[PDB]
Structures are given as structure tokens and as C-alpha cells.
Amino acid sequence: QELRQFIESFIQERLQGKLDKLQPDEDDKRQTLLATHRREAWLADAARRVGQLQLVTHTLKPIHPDARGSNLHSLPQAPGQPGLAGSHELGDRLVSDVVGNAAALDVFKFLSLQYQGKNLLNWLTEDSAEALQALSDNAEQAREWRQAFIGITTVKGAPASHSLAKQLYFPLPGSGYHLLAPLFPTSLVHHVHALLREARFGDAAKAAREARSRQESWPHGFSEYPNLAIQKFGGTKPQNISQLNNERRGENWLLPSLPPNWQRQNVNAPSVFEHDFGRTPEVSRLTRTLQRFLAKTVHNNLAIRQRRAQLVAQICDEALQYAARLRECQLHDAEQLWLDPLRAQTDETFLQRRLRGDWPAEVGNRFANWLNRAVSSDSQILGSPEAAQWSQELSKELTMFKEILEDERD
Amino acid sequence: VTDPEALLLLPRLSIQNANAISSPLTWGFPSPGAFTGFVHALQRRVGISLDIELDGVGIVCHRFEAQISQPAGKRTKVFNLTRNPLNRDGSTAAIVEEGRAHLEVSLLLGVHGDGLDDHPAQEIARQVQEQAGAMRLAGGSILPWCNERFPAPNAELLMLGGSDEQRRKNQRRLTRRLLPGFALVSREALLQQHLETLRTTLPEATTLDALLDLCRINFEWQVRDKPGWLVPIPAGYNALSPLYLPGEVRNARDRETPLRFVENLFGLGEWLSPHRVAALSDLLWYHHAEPDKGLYRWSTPRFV
Amino acid sequence: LSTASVLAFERKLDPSDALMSAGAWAQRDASQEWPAVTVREKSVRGTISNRLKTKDRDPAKLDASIQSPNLQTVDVANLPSDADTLKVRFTLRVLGGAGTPSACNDAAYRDKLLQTVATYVNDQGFAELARRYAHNLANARFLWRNRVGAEAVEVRINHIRQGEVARAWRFDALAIGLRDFKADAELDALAELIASGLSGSGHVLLEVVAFARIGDGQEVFPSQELILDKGDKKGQKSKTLYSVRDAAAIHSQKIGNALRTIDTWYPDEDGLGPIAVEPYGSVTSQGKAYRQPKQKLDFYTLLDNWVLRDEAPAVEQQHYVIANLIRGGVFG
Amino acid sequence: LSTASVLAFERKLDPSDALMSAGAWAQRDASQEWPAVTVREKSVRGTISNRLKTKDRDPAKLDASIQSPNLQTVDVANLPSDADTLKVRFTLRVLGGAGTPSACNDAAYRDKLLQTVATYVNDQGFAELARRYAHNLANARFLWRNRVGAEAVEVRINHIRQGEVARAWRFDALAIGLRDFKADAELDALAELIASGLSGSGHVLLEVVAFARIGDGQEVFPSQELIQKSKTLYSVRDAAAIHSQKIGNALRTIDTWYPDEDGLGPIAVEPYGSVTSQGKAYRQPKQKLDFYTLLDNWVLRDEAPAVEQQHYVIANLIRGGVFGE
Amino acid sequence: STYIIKEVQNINSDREGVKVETTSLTSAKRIASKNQFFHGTVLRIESESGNWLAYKEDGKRWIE
Amino acid sequence: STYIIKEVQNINSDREGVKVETTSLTSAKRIASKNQFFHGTVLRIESESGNWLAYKEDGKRWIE
DNA sequence: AGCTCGAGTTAAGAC
DNA sequence: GCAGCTCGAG
DNA sequence: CTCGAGCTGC
DNA sequence: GTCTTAACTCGAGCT
């Protein structure tokens, strides 16, 4: 019978706030509108003024202030058959806010208490004894008001998209298409944003960053989100935009989704004695990653046999990209056969006798030598098959490299 | 997931002022759905005239140049907006979020239409490139290839005929011109593997994607390692409401197909160099939809 | 037969970014390898010289406001040490099928619109609009400030077909009137080609190259890049110039806005010259919006009447309506 | 007829950056290929020369400070070991249409302004402003500190038409009075050319090249860039230069009609007659000489101020700015 | 609470400011508005250190 | 964690150091200060490799 | 200490 | 092996 | 002011 | 029903 300790409490907790600005001329016409309202009438305004707003989790407004559409709260769907992951795997922690008039927002804060100390969100649609025994309000008003408190969580009564709703077509298997009218996922957005609030500038995460700065090891893990992008959607004013956005800063962080060539470089590789040197951030980072696994034992024969093999594949592919961006002297001569300079057709024999069947395939050995000069020649694993099997990995990778090299122009 | 008989390769397609958001929680290269629908629309206009079938689209990103400015307060970048025209009332315009960037991409079109044999492959390629130029991809203009240098033609290669030696030689020849850019493919296997791996900690799916796509540091120091470039992508649109007849949905731009309110569904994609893939057809993205369940995904099943 | 709640038209005559470079007028005809203009940073020190808000009775307060100057870091683009000619290169495409709506709610409305469009085309072709666009392309109206104070402006338009061959034309912006449109054989040919492209020939590509004589070390005026986010710290750039491929350029839409400056039939026509083809005849620079909706010249009103009520407006209004449809937007 | 909340005037007489180089005064006739002055860095120590708080000023505080000196890095540009002449090259253009507003909210205001401007031009031409500008171009006022302590300063102003040199001019900055404007045939001709250009009678392009004798290995004073490192010099293409605005500010040192008649002499045309070095702004708004008041009265109320004030107003319109509300 | 009130043409600029030493930010905002010598300047309230507290455009409301 | 504590006249020098093998840098800093054998030397902490971790002048605080 | 000012916040006319 | 004590950073 | 962590004596 | 401006109360600095 504790519901009254929430309704008669929260409202009384609310009235006391309505007294800070209340004079003897206002305390009279507000006495029964607040004091007695805590009993039955403060809720009367709600069930009468709940149709003004609408609790939802996916809205249309974020895509334009002028647009008008249909907001939705219901999401029981979850058809994720392979790893797929989105708004359909929350279940709980569904933090939802309202859509409508800016006049009344605390009316929703009263409904927001549907979990503040009990399972009242389940009682907001059932458990009438909670309202008919503790709240002791009539079922003709209380449970009827409970309906208008549930009607706030459903559509106004008509479906509709808009000309700016950002619709699409969509094909089907051998038959005619269907079109979707997607919306904004406020709930998932807020879940992610709370995660980011917690990790980006949390207390424990900040302490872990301090530990990384002081080179001190303790039992905690911290991560960094770079290259976020800020979206100032909803307009300058929080009002006229999603209430959750208004509660938050009003800017939605977007996780980077760029390809590996976003921050391009100014191609300048005409250093000529430095043919295989070619040092850049990706190259040196891959080299440091290899040397960091070179300081491991053979207890991870398999683990270090793939990550390092995949890594050298990445390295040779990055060298291929170097060559490509070049395409578009002795130390560059054999490289002039690997790094075909301009696909030179001018030279008669230097381009059809020194290149026709003359793909200097020693460049692979040049690069293997540069790598052996990069990753230390620690004999700790050379005695056993650890570094010898690493050499075999290198060898077969460079063999596939030369297989791809043979046919530059042949 | 039909096996494509032949593949048409658009050598280079430049785009200016494209759509760089492509998703509520991510920004960057446009969603693959945009390309699948693009190829579908091409089939919709030229496919009927030439009686060809296009279902597979390959993606190679040659150049990506965004329009962003880094603020001095934080390390989070922002986009460069445009100026909207003055409203009719005469008051100042309202600023709205938008994105623009320069994207140079090359597309691979899987030709499943049997009619290809009835027409010259080179002519089909030229005709397709002509329509491709006038079309608008990702929400921005497609700039045709006009410059001081010679133009870049479209090469069509048949993958049904020939010995494995000729097939491999042709595939190698194609990769030679597609090397400057990196391809895009969807990897959901690792995502599910990690989900089961970290299920003990908490049964959170979004958390796993967030944790995987970040610089993870462990206390010891060291930085967590990933096998390749992994990034979130809009895997598809899950059904958010039941289907409604075209009349029920107001302001629908078409009365032929019913409207459905959907949400966003993510995944985990990987950027792999063309040389790693042996068969190009496994790279092509194919859209598959289920009428009963609202799951619509563009992931390429043949890659696995 | 009501209107369609959803109407959209893909824009036509969509240009691309405009790259810039510098060089010598002598080599302009024979050299197209001119190096690009790189953006640079400069500092400026200022004395507040704007209008006053406080009572103008404060002598020493004003002196103190002076002694506290203003500092800001800006971006400027200037030609090389020895360069008197500016080059701008941008392409332009004509898609066609202007009247063809991209999306329409009702089929009947779309058919009715197409019928009205066909009637208009039969009565009179787009030759008027094509000729107006021809003038804009010939002259440097797309250029905003570079044209002012120019000795000789030379525009060269090449129609790029699959191959390099083209019906290359050459004009003079200064000789051609900026505020007046005159007929010429070359202009007519170009207008005809544009009209064909607009009708939906299938492919149209126009490479525009401009050469403007400004002076050695002169300052060009590219399009300032908007941000909308000032920043939480000091030491920033209060002017960012748009640059692509480490070269300055002008936004595609800013060029496409100037190219469609054919609305000369506005009601006032009292001293004002050509105006941008925009709904409600809005103008950003002047800050006023001509053609308010109360009158009948409004685009929405004219189109609704001419479609539903079949009221044929003046030939001028019909041209304006077709121009707006070409520009595209969201209606209903 | 209230004023327009939005008013802007594109600047006229817009110069370019001013590059610098060195050479021998003898070779002055042929000055091309001369190597530019490259900025360099030099360590420099400091000490306590500023004003101490007599309370914070104590015997041992000084011993501490001077025993802990504030090092500093700065940038200076000096001529080569054997070089006595500095060279400055900057172009100048005359656009015209000074009165023509770039943007105006109300059409009536723009028309009224144009009418007043046309009336002024008809009554009297820009010959006065052009003649005053001519003096600044002839003399070295554009140079700020390089002129000080110079043996001989020679300015050469050419005229470029269609890529050819229409007419050249050679003057002497020292002989021409800095604070006094005297009439001369060459100055009059230059003023006529400038007046024609502003009125819109034809294109005007002026290449200004100055040669000042300072001394061997002397230290030039280029324009300092905005801010360890204290002083940062502006270099373009690995060459020292002077800012465009800094030159256009000096070229417009035409305001000598202030209400004080002090010995300061020429003042730059700036609203409210502000001066940074002197730290005082003449022509305060309390008086009627302020630019804003003058324009408001002479446009809306048709009150024609003195001819001098009209010249000042035209100079302000030429300078450009942001007006209204 | 020491607050530095500054005025500039553009929101991004550096200029000296007077030390108000007011109790709260609301006070500094109203003080800057009451004591303003120009129309196009942008009032910017800053603490004694280099951290920007808030700014206000001529035609816009306070923003942080 | 092997940390090399060195003493030198100028920040730029190559002089050998003792291997402390402490857990964290704060420990190495306190140890270096407590074990400084000279007044005008410049403490330089470096890892087992040649990478400079931090340096501290006689009259100045630690820098990274 | 009265009064000024502006910030914060309120609710009714008009669409 | 263990722990009081000293020292030096925050 | 309070707060870690290496050394030496029991 | 709706959003807007003008209105309210509110708080802090001169003279």
C-alpha cells in the first residue's frame, strides 16, 4: 500500500516547490489546486492533459523542425538471426521521453516515477489494487485515468509519413518493392551516449588514463574514442526537439566510420637510397606491433602465427599501395622494376627489354632484408622453430608477393 | 545469392557533395544500401531496355575527402554546413545538419542476365557508363571523367568461360587497376564470436561493437589488437511497426507499395584490399529481404 | 483533383566545385598546367570603428576602447609573385527530363503536370531560358568579386563528348552585358544545345574555363566556408576558405545559384537587375524577398492555378515556373 | 527614411602583399632576380626593464629575477652582409564605384546615397583625394620604419595596360613633404589617372617599387605576425613581406581636417579618427564631425556639411566597412 | 568570482577585458549587457584563467 | 619496469645509469632525487632502450 | 538606499 | 624473512 | 599540510 | 490545439 508514498509524496514534494513563488494572493487559489490536488486533482490535470504529449522512443522530428509525423513507443521486435545488433537488444534500461507541448514536462516526471522504488511501470497498466487501495481512487476515474496514462504511450490514432521523412524504395526477391520510412532511435542513442559519458570522461576511466600517464599498473581497463563527429540536430533550442535531447547536451556523437585512406598524404617519393625504408605512421606502427609480438614466447605458437602472418600481409599490401600511389636510382632501379616508374613506354629496351621479362623479383629480397633490419635478429627464437617458422611465414608471404609481382605488365 | 555469370567494372566514379552521415550513430562512407539501390535503379532503367539482370555491386574506395573542421576545444570534429536561403517571412533561415564530401569509387556490377551474350560486352559497358554518369549516387552529383589525361574505359569480363589459369590471369588483371583503393565487406562472424566470448561479462550486443571498434588498452601497458580494419555499418532496417497499406500511410510518395516504419540495424564490416580476395563475385553485395520479418540486410553471404 | 503532398525535382544544370589556379595571360591559350593557388594564413590588428550604443558623451572610455584593439587570424588567397591571370575550371551537366517529377503522391497530378509542361514546350521552347543561361555562362556572373576590376575576361566552353572532340566556343564577358541579354549566333547555338540536353537527349557535359586579368599579387575571393560552431578556446581562424586537393575552390551550389539568375520579371523592376530563381524570389545579399505569397506571382500559387485551374499565366511567369522546377525543391 | 541596418562597401584601392629583397643602390635601375630577405631566428636574452610595483619592488627580488633571466626567441630580418638598398614591390588597383553599396536592406536608402554621391562628384571631382593619395604613393609613407634614417629613397610607380608599361614615374620621398601636399605636374597626372579609375573611366593597375638606402647589414622592420617565441614575422614563399591592410591603412593617411589642428599632421582615414600609436581618437561623437553623424545628416536630413567633411565621408566610403545596425 | 568581460567584432578574437569581480555568472551577463560600448561586438565572459565561460552574440541569447 | 637514472651536465648527453627496476615512474623520480650525487647535474630517466622518458633540470620540475 | 538595468520566466493574442 | 624508518611528490 | 616506497636493523 | 512576444518578477550595481 506504498503507492500513496509516491503519488501523495511526489506531489507534496512538488507543491513545496510551488511555494517558493507563491504569495498570499496565490496561496489561496493554489491551495486546493495543489494541496487537495495531491489527492485526486493533480492527476485529473494529467488524464485531461496527457493527450497533449506522447511518450515514444523513435521520432520523426529530428530530421526537420517543419516536418510532422507519427512517433512510436512500441519495440518488441528482435529479428537478429546472425550477429546483428541494434535497438532490438535493450530489453531493460529503456530510457524514454515525451513528444509534444513544452508547457507540461513535470507531468511526465510524475509518470517517470513508474520505476522509482517499485515496478510501477507494470502498475501503470495493471495492479489496480495499487491505485484502488493505496491511491484509493475510483476505478471509474483512476483506472480510466490509467488508460489515458497508457494512451499517452500509443499513436494519436492515425499513421502518416511526410515529404521530408527521408523515405526510400527497397527491392524484394523477384517481386515488386516496398518502401521504408525510417526514424530516429532516441533510446539506443541515449544508451550509447550514457556509455560514452561513462567511458570518455568517467571517474574510473580518468583514473586509468592517469595510471597510463604515470606508467603505473593497477586492476582497471580504460579505452579512448577518437575522431567523433558532433551533430547539432533539433535546432539551437532544445524545445521543439526530442525531450531526451533537451535533457542531454543536444549534440549526438557519431562513431568514426572512415576507410583507412581518410587522412591522405601528400605523395612525395621521387630518400632514393631509402627504397624499402618508406616510413609512415601505419608502416612504423605495424613494425612496432610485430616487434611487440617478437618479444613473446612460443607458448602461443598458433596465436602468434596468424596475427603476425596477417600483419605481414598488411605490410606487403601497404607496400603495394605505396607502389600504386607512386604509379599514378640504383636503389630505385630494381624498385624501378617493382615500382614500375610511370609504366614507361618511351625507352625501347629499358621498357621492353629491361621490363618485358625483367620484373626484378629481387625487390622481394630487398624488402625481406629491410624487414630483418627492422625487426631485431634476436637468436632467442632462432635456435628453436619459433623464429624459423616465422621465417617460413615471411617466406611464403613474400612468395605470394612475387607471384603477384610477376604480372605487373606481362 | 545467385552466381554471377559476368562482372562489369566501372573504372572510376567521382562524387561531390555526397551524404557523409549515412547513419544516426556513425558518419563516413555512405551506407552499402545506397549502392545496392543504385545498381537496382540502373537495372530499373537500362535492365529492361537491354534485358539484363544486375544484382551484385562491388565497392572499392579510391579517394575520400570530407568537409570537416576540427575545433580547438575538443578532439571531436564537426561538419561544414551550408547556408539555407532566406525564408518567405523574411526572417533568418534555420541552420540544419548536413554533410558533404568527395568520394571517388569504382563499382563492380554482377551481370546475371543471359541477354549479355546477345550484345557486345564493350557496348553494354559504354551504355551503362552513360546512364551511370547522369545518375546521382549517395545524394550528390556524379562527376564524369573529364580532364587533361585520357578517359578511363569500362572493362567487362566473363567469369563462366575459360580454364582456371585464364580465370586467375583475368582476375589479376582486374585487381591491377583496382589496387589504389580498398574494398568493403561485412564480417558478422567475428561479431557473433565475440558476443559469445563476452557473454559472461554481460549480455550486451551494442557494447561489444563499441568495445571492438576502439583503441582498447589493458592494464599491465599495451593496446588491444585487431586483425584488420573493423568499422560499424548500417547492416539494415529492422521492422519497427506492422505493415500498412499505401492508403494508410499519409504523404507516401508512392501508392504502389505499402509503407513500413523501420529502425536502424548495425553490423561489423571490414576493409580488405582487392588482392586478398580470390573470387571477386564473393565481394559483391547482394540485398536480401524477407516479407514476413522486417530484416533487410545487404551483407555479402558468399564472402564466408 | 487536389495537389500532391509530396513533390520533388532533382536539380538540373548541376555544376561541380570550381578549381582555381594562376598563370600568365600569354600562356593561357597554350598552357593548362597552371599551378593551383594554396591557401595561406595572415594576422590582422584592428581598431573598433563600428557604430555606437552607449551615449556618445564618453571621451576617455572611447580612447580606452581604442587602446584595446582587436586581433583575429584569417585566411586569404593571393596569386603567385608573378601572375596576372586567374583561372577557374568547373564542369556542368545537363540531365534533362526537367518536367519529369522525381516523386509524386498522385498519378493523375503527375500526368496533368506533364501535360501542361508538354503544352508549354510545344507553344514555346526553353530557348529563352537556355539563352539566358548561355549569357550567364559566357559572362563571369558566376564569379562574384574576381570579375570586378578586370581588364579582360575570356571564357572557353568545351562540350565534352565521349572523346575529346567538342564544339568549343569562346566568348568575352566584358563585351557581353551583365544586366542585359543580347542575341548572338554562338549564344543561340549554345542555347539550342542546352535546350536539347534539358529535353533529355541523354548526356551533356560542359567544361568551363575562365581567364580573368586581375594583377600581380592580387587577392582572389573564394567562398568562405561556414562552420556553425565557434569553439570553446582562443586562437582560431575567423575565416576559412573552401579548398579541395590542397587547392582553393568555390562551392558547387554557390555557382549553380548564379547560373540560374534569370528572374528579371519581378513585380518591382525598379532599379534592380537580374535576380536568383528562388521560391518567393528571396535574395540573401539584399536581405529582401520579392514576390510575397499574397500576390499571384508566387511560384506555389502560379503552379497550383496553372495545373488545377488550367489558368495560363503570362509567358514570363511560365518561364519563371519552369526555372523553379529546374532548380528543384520540396513542395506540397 | 531611417538608416539601413545592413550596409557594406567593398574596399577600393586594394593593394597586394609587399615583397622585399636586397641589392646594390647602383644596380637600382635593373632590379630583378634579387634574392629575397629570408626570415631567421636568433636567441636573445632579456632582463628586468619594465615597471615594478614599488611594493613588489624589493632589493632581493631583483637579485633573484636578474639571477633567473627570461630567455626568448624572436625573428629578425637583416639585409645581406654587403647590401645597402631595400626593395618593396606591391601592386595597387583602382576599382571605382565607391558610393555603390555592396548590400543594402532598403532600396530607398541606396538610391538616396547614390544621388548624394553623384551630386558630390558633379560639384567637385575626386582630384583632391587622388592628389593626396598620390603623395603617399610617391613618398615612402607606406614604409613604416625602413624610411626612418634613410639616405636616399626613390619610388618608381609604373602603369600596366594590357601587359605593357603605359607610363612610368620616378619620385623622391625625402624631397616631397610628408606633412604638406604640394602640387607637381607628375603628381597631378597621377591624381588624374586615379580619379579617372575611381569614376570608372578605365582600368588602373599600379606596380609600386621602392628603393631605400639604409646601410650594410641593417635590420629591416617587416610586419609582425600575431602571437619561447615573442616576435613572429610574416613570410610568403620564404620571403618577408608587409600586410595588405597595413599598406592600405597608410595609403589613406588623408585625414587632416580634424577639429584640433595640432602638429600631428596627416591622420589615417578611420571612423572616429582613431590612432593606435597616439592612443587617442580625434573627431569624437560628441562633436558633429564624426563620420556616422555626418553621413546620417547629409543623407537623411540633406544637410550638406563643409566640403572637407564631404571629402572625409568619401574617404570613409572608399575604405569600406560595416555600418547601420 | 573574477570574470573578464571582453568585446570583439568576431566571436574568435583576443582583446583585454575589465575585471568585474562579480558574485555569479548571471551578474556578469547582465553587467556586460548594461555596460556595452558597441552594437556589433560579441560579449564574451571569461574567468581569470584561459577557459571560456560563455559568449553572447548581438542578435542571439547567451550560449555556453 | 627497468628505468635508467642518469646524471649529466647538459640535458643532451650519453652517460650510463643504474637499473632501478621500479614499478612506476613516481618511484624512479623519488629515487633519482634521493640519490642525486651532484647539484648541477640534469636527471634524465630513460627506459631500457634509448628512448628518453623524462628529464629534470636542477632548478626546474620534471618534464615529459 | 531608491532607482536603474537586464536575466529569467511567465501567459494571452493570433495563426 | 620481516617491518620501522627515512626520503621525496601532490 | 598529507601522501608513496626503498633501505636497514631486529 | 498551436507558438510567439511582451509581460511579469527577480537580482545586482551607481550616487
Side-chain angles (χ1 to χ4, degrees), chain B residues 16-17 63 67 69 72 80-82 86 100 102 133-134 136 141-144 252-253 255, chain C residues 5-6 11 14 16-17 89 91 93 95 104-105 160 205 225-227 236 242 244-245 252-253 280 283:
Chain B
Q16 297 183 359
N17 306 151
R63 186 180 299 178
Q67 300 181 3
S69 296
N80 299 338
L81 299 180
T82 180
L86 299 179
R100 294 176 178 175
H102 313 99
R136 298 174 61 268
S141 299
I142 301 175
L143 178 69
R253 61 205 184 99
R255 303 300 182 181
Chain C
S5 60
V6 182
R11 70 188 182 275
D14 184 5
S16 62
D17 303 326
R89 175 177 173 280
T91 59
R93 308 187 313 172
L95 302 182
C104 190
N105 303 120
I160 299 173
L205 180 58
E225 186 67 3
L226 161 63
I227 307 293
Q236 296 187 158
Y242 176 82
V244 298
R245 300 295 302 179
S252 60
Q253 76 292 357
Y280 295 92
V283 190

Side-chain angles (χ1 to χ4, degrees), chain C residues 36 38 40-50 59-60 62-64 66-67 69 71-73 76 78-84 144-152 213-219 221 271 284-288 290, chain D residues 6 10-12 14-17 19 89-95 102-107 110-111 160-163 203-205 207 224-227 234 236-237 243-245 270-272 274-276 278-282 284-287 292 319 322-324:
Chain C
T38 58
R40 53 177 62 178
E41 300 179 2
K42 74 175 190 180
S43 294
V44 305
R45 180 161 175 283
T47 75
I48 297 286
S49 61
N50 309 19
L62 181 147
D63 298 326
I66 292 298
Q67 280 157 120
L71 306 178
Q72 60 190 152
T73 299
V76 298
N78 305 333
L79 286 69
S81 61
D82 52 331
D84 56 0
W144 296 105
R145 184 169 183 181
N146 303 328
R147 181 178 185 173
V148 175
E151 294 177 359
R213 294 182 60 86
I214 319 183
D216 292 324
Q218 286 295 319
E219 177 175 354
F221 300 91
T284 62
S285 60
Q286 184 171 6
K288 295 292 182 172
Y290 300 100
Chain D
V6 184
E10 295 178 356
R11 55 184 182 281
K12 273 61 183 184
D14 185 4
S16 58
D17 303 328
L19 304 173
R89 175 177 175 282
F90 61 92
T91 59
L92 176 61
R93 289 196 307 162
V94 185
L95 305 176
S102 61
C104 192
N105 300 122
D106 185 5
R110 171 171 183 179
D111 299 331
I160 300 174
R161 292 190 63 84
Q162 282 66 11
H203 200 260
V204 181
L205 173 53
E207 179 180 354
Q224 175 188 345
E225 187 61 14
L226 181 48
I227 61 171
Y234 180 74
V236 297
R237 193 174 297 276
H243 292 76
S244 60
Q245 72 283 3
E270 189 64 9
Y272 296 100
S274 58
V275 191
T276 61
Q278 298 299 283
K280 61 189 299 185
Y282 300 103
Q284 293 181 0
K286 67 182 189 301
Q287 298 183 359
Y292 295 149
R319 175 181 175 277
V322 184
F323 302 144

Side-chain angles (χ1 to χ4, degrees), chain C residues 106-129:
Chain C
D106 186 4
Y109 184 59
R110 174 173 183 178
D111 299 331
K112 184 62 173 179
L113 178 62
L114 293 175
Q115 287 177 0
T116 301
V117 168
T119 302
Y120 168 88
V121 169
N122 298 329
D123 298 330
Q124 54 183 352
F126 299 155
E128 184 63 11
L129 300 181

